């Protein structure tokens, strides 16, 4: 086509979606990880995760307001990944890298799994 | 913070949200423009437009599944702007620039209004 493109549009959209999340505006699901609860937008979860994409395209699960993750999933690992989904920023540290990689493998977030493998290989 | 950043994350999120729109997955509103109907995600509309942000933060309007725009709004101008919201690409042409600028002013999409003003000033 003969379209023009606004370079910062995608980043600005994501910044606003994170602002809606922080104010709990139009969140339509709660993700339960052990005792911890995380509110989010189903569409953002699907856009970032192969696991949520599969869950919310399912004719029965698409209508659930509560999703319980596998008890092996660490709440801190999930929180770091949820923050990444809404910001593009990953808080990867020596003390959390194993929990982050395991959570990213479960959530099917290929690019996060790739950077965790590389950072582990270096150490 | 000491975060790392994935450069293509915001663009990849937007690409997936557009894939959900094209398949009509988790769309929660229909925007009526004259006789034409456009399905979309309320959160994406809010993230892109000052007008939709105001509408869907309103305690009564947040629950509406149908929104009727002002009869002066041109359906083609709206379609071009909706495509921009989901892609960052604007199909701006000599034959549509006046309808696009008027629709962007109504929708309160400041960056689109700015490029339309500049393109009109040049001609």
């Amino acid at each position: 086509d003969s379209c023009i493109q606004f370079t910062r549009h995608a980043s600005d959209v994501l910044l606003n979606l994170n602002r809606l999340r922080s104010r709990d505006i139009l969140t339509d699901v709660v993700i339960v990880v052990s005792r911890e609860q995380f509110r989010a937008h189903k569409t953002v979860l699907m856009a970032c995760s192969g696991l949520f994409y599969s869950i919310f395209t399912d004719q029965l699960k698409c209508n659930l307001s509560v999703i319980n993750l596998d008890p092996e999933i660490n709440p801190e690992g999930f929180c770091i990944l949820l923050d990444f989904m809404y910001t593009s920023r990953l808080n990867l540290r020596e003390g959390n890298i194993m929990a982050v990689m395991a959570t990213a493998m479960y959530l099917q977030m290929e690019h996060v799994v790739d950077t965790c493998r590389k950072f582990i290989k270096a150490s | 913070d000491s975060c790392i950043q994935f450069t293509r994350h915001a663009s990849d999120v937007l690409l997936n949200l557009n894939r959900l729109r094209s398949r009509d997955i988790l769309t929660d509103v229909v925007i009526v423009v004259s006789r034409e109907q456009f399905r979309a995600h309320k959160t994406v509309l809010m993230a892109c437009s000052g007008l939709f942000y105001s509408i869907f933060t309103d305690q009564l309007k947040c629950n509406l599944s149908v929104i009727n725009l002002d009869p002066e709004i041109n359906p083609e101008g709206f379609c071009i702007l909706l495509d921009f919201m989901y892609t960052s690409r604007l199909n701006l042409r000599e034959g549509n620039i006046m309808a696009v600028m008027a629709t962007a002013m109504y929708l309160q999409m400041e960056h689109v209004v700015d490029t339309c003003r500049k393109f009109i000033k040049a001609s």
């Binding site: 379209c3 023009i4 493109q5 606004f6 370079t7 | 690409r89 604007l90 490029t115």
Partner: peptide, 4 residues
């Protein structure tokens, strides 16, 4: 704005 750019030419993509």
């Amino acid at each position: 704005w750019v030419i993509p």
